[PDB]
Coordinates of C-alpha atoms and ligand atoms in Angstrom, one line a residue:
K1 CA 118.0 96.6 95.2
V2 CA 115.1 99.0 95.4
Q3 CA 111.5 98.5 92.9
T4 CA 111.0 100.4 90.3
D5 CA 108.0 102.1 89.0
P6 CA 107.0 100.5 86.2
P7 CA 108.4 97.1 88.3
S8 CA 111.6 95.7 86.6
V9 CA 113.4 94.3 89.2
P10 CA 112.9 90.9 90.2
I11 CA 111.8 89.8 93.4
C12 CA 115.1 88.1 94.1
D13 CA 116.9 91.4 93.8
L14 CA 114.9 93.0 96.6
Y15 CA 115.6 90.7 99.3
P16 CA 119.6 90.1 100.3
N17 CA 119.3 86.4 101.6
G18 CA 116.8 85.2 99.9
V19 CA 114.3 85.4 102.8
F20 CA 111.0 85.9 101.2
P21 CA 108.0 87.8 102.9
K22 CA 105.2 85.8 104.8
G23 CA 101.4 86.0 103.9
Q24 CA 98.8 86.1 106.5
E25 CA 99.5 83.7 109.0
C26 CA 96.2 82.4 110.7
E27 CA 95.7 79.8 113.8
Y28 CA 93.7 77.0 112.6
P29 CA 90.1 76.7 113.0
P30 CA 88.4 74.6 116.4
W31 CA 98.5 73.6 120.2
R32 CA 100.4 73.9 117.0
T33 CA 101.9 77.6 116.8
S34 CA 104.6 72.2 119.4
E35 CA 108.3 71.4 119.2
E36 CA 107.5 68.6 117.0
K37 CA 105.7 71.1 114.4
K38 CA 108.0 73.8 114.7
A39 CA 111.0 71.9 113.2
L40 CA 108.4 70.1 110.8
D41 CA 107.3 73.2 109.3
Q42 CA 111.1 74.7 109.7
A43 CA 112.5 71.4 107.8
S44 CA 110.2 73.0 104.8
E45 CA 111.8 76.2 105.0
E46 CA 113.2 76.3 101.4
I47 CA 109.5 75.4 100.1
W48 CA 107.6 78.0 101.8
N49 CA 110.3 80.7 100.9
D50 CA 109.8 79.4 97.2
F51 CA 106.0 79.9 97.3
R52 CA 106.4 83.4 99.4
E53 CA 108.9 85.0 96.5
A54 CA 106.3 83.8 93.8
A55 CA 103.7 85.4 96.3
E56 CA 105.5 88.7 96.7
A57 CA 106.0 88.6 92.3
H58 CA 102.0 87.9 92.3
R59 CA 101.5 91.1 94.4
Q60 CA 103.7 93.0 92.8
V61 CA 102.1 92.4 89.0
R62 CA 99.0 92.6 90.0
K63 CA 99.2 96.0 91.4
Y64 CA 100.6 97.4 88.7
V65 CA 97.7 95.6 86.4
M66 CA 95.4 97.9 88.6
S67 CA 97.2 100.6 88.1
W68 CA 96.5 100.6 84.2
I69 CA 93.9 98.2 83.1
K70 CA 91.1 100.1 81.2
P71 CA 88.6 99.3 78.7
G72 CA 89.9 100.3 75.4
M73 CA 92.8 98.0 75.8
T74 CA 92.3 94.7 73.7
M75 CA 92.8 91.4 75.7
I76 CA 96.1 90.6 73.8
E77 CA 97.7 94.0 75.1
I78 CA 96.3 93.8 78.7
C79 CA 97.8 89.8 78.7
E80 CA 101.1 90.8 76.9
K81 CA 101.8 93.8 79.5
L82 CA 100.8 91.4 82.8
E83 CA 102.9 88.9 81.6
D84 CA 105.7 91.1 80.6
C85 CA 105.9 92.3 84.0
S86 CA 105.5 88.5 85.6
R87 CA 108.5 87.5 83.7
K88 CA 110.6 90.2 85.0
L89 CA 109.8 89.9 88.2
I90 CA 110.2 86.3 89.0
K91 CA 113.2 86.7 86.9
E92 CA 111.9 84.0 84.1
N93 CA 114.6 81.1 84.1
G94 CA 113.5 78.1 82.2
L95 CA 111.3 75.4 84.8
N96 CA 113.5 76.9 87.7
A97 CA 110.9 80.2 87.6
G98 CA 108.6 81.6 85.6
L99 CA 104.9 81.6 84.6
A100 CA 102.8 78.9 86.1
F101 CA 100.0 79.2 83.8
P102 CA 98.4 81.6 81.3
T103 CA 96.9 84.9 82.3
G104 CA 93.1 84.2 82.6
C105 CA 91.3 87.5 81.9
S106 CA 87.7 85.9 80.9
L107 CA 84.7 88.2 80.6
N108 CA 81.3 89.0 81.6
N109 CA 79.4 84.9 81.5
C110 CA 83.0 83.5 80.6
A111 CA 84.3 82.5 84.6
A112 CA 87.7 81.3 83.8
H113 CA 90.3 79.6 81.5
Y114 CA 89.9 82.3 78.5
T115 CA 92.8 83.7 77.4
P116 CA 93.3 85.1 73.8
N117 CA 94.9 83.4 71.3
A118 CA 96.8 85.4 68.4
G119 CA 94.6 87.6 65.9
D120 CA 91.6 87.9 69.3
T121 CA 90.3 91.7 68.2
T122 CA 88.6 91.5 71.6
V123 CA 88.5 95.2 73.4
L124 CA 87.7 95.7 77.0
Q125 CA 84.5 97.4 77.7
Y126 CA 83.4 99.9 80.6
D127 CA 80.9 97.7 81.6
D128 CA 83.1 94.2 81.3
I129 CA 83.3 91.9 84.7
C130 CA 87.1 90.8 84.2
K131 CA 88.4 87.7 86.0
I132 CA 91.8 88.4 86.0
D133 CA 93.6 84.9 87.2
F134 CA 97.6 84.2 86.5
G135 CA 100.1 82.3 88.1
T136 CA 103.8 82.5 89.1
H137 CA 106.5 80.2 90.8
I138 CA 109.6 79.2 91.7
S139 CA 111.2 75.8 91.4
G140 CA 107.2 74.5 90.6
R141 CA 106.2 76.0 94.0
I142 CA 103.2 77.4 92.5
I143 CA 100.9 80.7 93.4
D144 CA 97.3 80.3 92.1
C145 CA 95.8 83.8 92.5
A146 CA 92.9 85.6 91.0
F147 CA 90.7 89.0 91.4
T148 CA 87.5 90.9 89.6
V149 CA 88.1 93.7 87.4
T150 CA 84.9 96.0 86.8
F151 CA 84.9 100.0 86.0
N152 CA 81.2 100.2 86.3
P153 CA 80.2 100.3 90.4
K154 CA 77.1 98.3 89.2
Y155 CA 79.2 95.0 90.4
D156 CA 80.4 96.1 93.8
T157 CA 78.5 94.0 95.7
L158 CA 78.5 91.0 93.6
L159 CA 82.2 91.4 94.0
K160 CA 81.8 91.4 97.6
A161 CA 79.6 88.5 98.1
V162 CA 82.6 86.5 95.6
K163 CA 85.3 88.1 97.8
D164 CA 83.2 87.4 101.3
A165 CA 82.8 83.8 100.2
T166 CA 86.4 83.0 99.1
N167 CA 87.5 84.7 102.3
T168 CA 85.1 82.1 104.5
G169 CA 86.6 79.3 102.6
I170 CA 89.9 80.3 103.4
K171 CA 89.3 80.7 107.0
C172 CA 87.2 77.5 107.4
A173 CA 90.0 75.2 105.6
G174 CA 92.4 73.5 108.0
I175 CA 94.5 70.6 108.9
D176 CA 91.5 67.4 109.0
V177 CA 89.1 69.5 107.7
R178 CA 86.6 68.0 105.7
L179 CA 86.3 69.2 102.1
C180 CA 82.7 69.3 102.0
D181 CA 82.3 71.4 104.8
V182 CA 84.4 74.2 103.0
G183 CA 82.0 74.0 100.3
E184 CA 79.0 74.3 102.4
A185 CA 80.5 77.1 104.3
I186 CA 81.4 79.0 101.0
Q187 CA 78.0 78.6 99.6
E188 CA 76.1 79.9 103.1
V189 CA 78.4 83.0 102.7
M190 CA 77.6 83.6 98.9
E191 CA 73.6 82.9 98.8
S192 CA 73.2 85.6 101.9
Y193 CA 73.8 87.9 99.2
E194 CA 71.5 89.8 97.6
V195 CA 72.1 92.1 94.3
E196 CA 70.8 94.5 92.3
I197 CA 72.3 95.1 88.6
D198 CA 70.3 97.0 86.0
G199 CA 67.2 96.9 88.1
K200 CA 67.0 93.1 88.6
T201 CA 67.4 91.6 91.7
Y202 CA 69.5 88.1 92.3
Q203 CA 70.6 85.9 94.7
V204 CA 74.3 85.5 94.2
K205 CA 74.8 81.6 92.9
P206 CA 78.2 79.5 94.0
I207 CA 78.8 78.2 89.9
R208 CA 78.5 74.8 91.1
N209 CA 80.5 72.9 88.8
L210 CA 83.8 75.2 89.7
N211 CA 86.0 74.3 92.8
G212 CA 89.5 75.2 94.6
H213 CA 92.0 72.9 94.6
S214 CA 95.3 71.2 95.9
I215 CA 98.2 72.4 94.5
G216 CA 101.6 70.0 93.5
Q217 CA 105.0 70.5 92.7
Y218 CA 104.9 71.9 89.2
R219 CA 101.3 70.5 89.6
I220 CA 98.7 73.2 89.2
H221 CA 95.8 70.6 90.3
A222 CA 96.9 67.5 92.3
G223 CA 94.2 65.7 92.5
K224 CA 91.7 67.0 95.7
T225 CA 88.9 69.6 94.8
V226 CA 87.4 72.0 97.6
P227 CA 83.8 72.6 96.5
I228 CA 82.1 75.9 96.8
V229 CA 78.5 74.1 97.3
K230 CA 77.2 71.6 99.7
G231 CA 77.0 67.9 99.6
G232 CA 80.8 66.8 98.5
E233 CA 83.3 64.6 99.4
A234 CA 84.1 64.4 103.5
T235 CA 87.8 63.7 102.3
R236 CA 90.2 65.6 104.7
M237 CA 92.7 68.2 104.3
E238 CA 95.9 66.9 105.3
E239 CA 98.7 68.9 106.9
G240 CA 101.5 70.0 104.5
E241 CA 98.9 70.1 101.6
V242 CA 99.0 73.8 99.5
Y243 CA 95.5 74.5 98.1
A244 CA 94.1 77.5 95.9
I245 CA 90.9 78.4 97.3
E246 CA 88.6 79.7 94.8
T247 CA 85.4 80.7 94.4
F248 CA 82.9 82.3 91.9
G249 CA 79.5 83.7 92.2
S250 CA 77.3 84.2 89.0
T251 CA 73.4 86.1 87.9
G252 CA 73.3 83.3 85.7
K253 CA 72.7 79.2 86.1
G254 CA 75.4 78.9 88.4
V255 CA 77.0 76.2 86.2
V256 CA 79.7 76.7 83.8
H257 CA 79.7 74.9 80.0
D258 CA 82.6 74.6 77.6
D259 CA 81.9 77.6 75.0
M260 CA 84.3 79.7 72.9
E261 CA 88.0 78.9 71.2
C262 CA 90.4 77.0 73.4
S263 CA 93.6 78.7 74.5
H264 CA 94.7 77.1 77.4
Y265 CA 96.4 73.3 77.3
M266 CA 98.4 71.2 79.7
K267 CA 100.4 68.2 79.4
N268 CA 98.5 65.3 81.4
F269 CA 101.0 65.4 84.6
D270 CA 100.4 61.2 85.1
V271 CA 101.3 60.3 81.1
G272 CA 104.6 58.6 80.6
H273 CA 107.0 59.1 78.2
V274 CA 105.9 58.4 74.9
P275 CA 108.0 58.0 71.5
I276 CA 106.8 60.3 68.8
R277 CA 108.1 59.8 65.6
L278 CA 105.1 62.2 63.3
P279 CA 108.0 65.4 63.0
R280 CA 105.7 68.2 63.8
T281 CA 104.1 66.2 66.7
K282 CA 108.0 65.2 68.1
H283 CA 109.2 68.5 67.9
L284 CA 106.1 70.2 69.5
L285 CA 105.9 67.9 72.4
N286 CA 109.9 68.3 72.8
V287 CA 109.0 72.5 72.9
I288 CA 106.2 71.6 75.5
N289 CA 108.9 69.2 77.6
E290 CA 111.7 71.9 77.5
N291 CA 109.4 74.9 78.0
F292 CA 106.4 73.8 80.0
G293 CA 107.2 70.3 81.4
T294 CA 103.5 69.7 83.4
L295 CA 103.0 73.6 83.9
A296 CA 99.9 74.9 81.8
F297 CA 100.6 77.2 78.7
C298 CA 98.5 78.8 76.1
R299 CA 98.8 79.1 72.2
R300 CA 100.3 82.5 72.6
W301 CA 103.2 80.9 74.6
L302 CA 104.1 78.6 71.6
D303 CA 103.8 81.8 69.1
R304 CA 106.5 83.7 70.9
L305 CA 108.9 80.9 70.7
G306 CA 108.8 80.8 67.0
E307 CA 106.0 77.7 66.5
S308 CA 103.9 78.2 63.7
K309 CA 101.2 76.4 61.7
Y310 CA 101.3 73.7 65.0
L311 CA 97.4 73.3 65.5
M312 CA 97.3 69.7 64.1
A313 CA 100.6 68.8 65.8
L314 CA 98.8 70.4 69.2
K315 CA 95.6 68.1 68.3
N316 CA 97.4 64.8 67.5
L317 CA 99.1 65.4 71.3
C318 CA 95.5 66.2 72.5
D319 CA 94.1 63.0 70.7
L320 CA 96.7 61.0 72.4
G321 CA 96.1 62.1 75.8
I322 CA 99.6 63.5 76.3
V323 CA 98.2 66.9 76.6
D324 CA 94.7 68.2 77.5
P325 CA 92.9 71.0 76.3
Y326 CA 91.0 73.1 78.9
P327 CA 88.8 75.7 77.2
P328 CA 87.1 78.7 78.5
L329 CA 84.0 77.9 80.9
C330 CA 80.8 80.0 80.4
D331 CA 77.7 80.6 82.3
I332 CA 74.6 81.6 80.1
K333 CA 74.2 84.2 77.6
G334 CA 73.9 87.6 79.7
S335 CA 74.9 86.7 83.0
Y336 CA 77.3 88.0 85.1
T337 CA 80.8 86.0 86.8
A338 CA 82.9 87.0 89.4
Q339 CA 85.7 85.2 91.3
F340 CA 88.6 85.8 94.1
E341 CA 91.1 83.2 94.9
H342 CA 94.0 82.7 96.7
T343 CA 96.5 80.3 97.6
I344 CA 97.1 79.0 101.3
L345 CA 100.1 76.5 102.6
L346 CA 98.6 74.1 105.4
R347 CA 102.0 74.4 107.7
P348 CA 102.3 72.4 110.7
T349 CA 102.3 75.1 112.9
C350 CA 99.7 77.7 111.7
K351 CA 97.5 78.3 108.0
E352 CA 99.6 80.8 105.9
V353 CA 97.6 82.9 103.3
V354 CA 100.3 83.3 101.7
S355 CA 99.4 84.9 98.3
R356 CA 97.2 87.6 100.6
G357 CA 98.1 91.5 99.7
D358 CA 96.8 94.8 101.1
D359 CA 94.5 94.7 98.1
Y360 CA 92.6 91.5 98.6
Ligands
HZT1 O1 89.8 74.5 86.7 S1 90.7 73.9 86.6 O2 91.1 73.0 85.3 C1 90.2 72.6 87.8 C2 89.7 73.1 89.2 C3 89.7 72.6 90.2 C4 90.1 70.6 89.8 S2 91.1 70.9 88.5 N1 91.6 74.5 87.3 C5 93.3 74.5 87.1 C6 94.2 74.9 85.8 C7 94.3 74.0 84.7 C8 94.3 74.1 83.6 C9 95.6 75.5 83.5 F1 95.7 75.7 82.1 C10 95.1 76.3 84.5 C11 94.6 75.8 85.7 C12 91.3 76.1 87.6 C13 92.1 77.4 87.7 N2 92.6 77.7 86.7 C14 93.2 78.9 86.7 N3 93.3 78.9 87.7 N4 92.4 78.0 88.6
MN2 MN1 93.4 80.6 89.5
MN3 MN1 92.8 77.5 90.8

């Protein structure tokens, strides 16, 4: 009925009749706040409500994380503590409710897609800049939302720059808005910031090959990309679409490349059923189909299901194009990267920043 400290009560039990809190509602940028639109919006109320339940789990998990995340903890300890909480609040139930993708805790010049695999001894340090990026879902309605953790105030202005650029992207987004215009607007704001870190000055660079993305049911990246620099596609955002608006700022080259051991994997959404006779590969694909479907997973999540010595079977599925690997994405050695991300609903009546909290 009432949430505990530490959080343990599922969000569904905190609401009496399955009506979850709305996120931040915004008027679209320059007639909708329309009977045709109001009815069209109401027709998807069950869907918006699923996003809101997942968003409330995301808000409660991240507030709890911020209370205890500290240097000295291992990255595994952080991810396990966060994920244990997330499973409880979302009331994990197979593909009906659960974790939408692994917990990113990328450090320093690593901007995204790093989560420890078994045996990783990495310890969070006082000077680290850590991007906590995790997702929850109800019925495949995904919340993709992220923030940056630091302990040293030297990164405060870099975080402020990226947060403002993400908020600028969110404000610019709308029905019939050109994706390229969102990218231009984000870049102008991010580049308006100069920061000083350890006696060196930088003009914050958007990471040009990182992007926001449309979201589909059980589909983290549905096909449209939201650039964070100028020169993109004039393709428009459409009514009823859902987007992850994320921005990344860097003190390095402002470009990422694959680096480090891969931890994130996801079945290719478009690949059809593929009969497998190789026993270990067949078993692993069945495990993936049963537990994740088209949602992303990580090696730790296969380990927890009691799977072991599966790396060759996993490589086989990647080589067949059934599963895609998503390795960590890093800028140059010595650079600092920061990220903020929210999920927005392009509802017929308004734009809802469904994952907005009192934090960011
Ligand atoms: O970089 S992405 O592949 C992408 C961005 C634009 C078009 S495709 N990607 C989606 C994703 C892919 C695999 C995962 F296991 C989890 C997520 C961004 C992202 N990661 C975390 N939050 N957001
Ligand atoms: Mn994310
Ligand atoms: Mn994303």
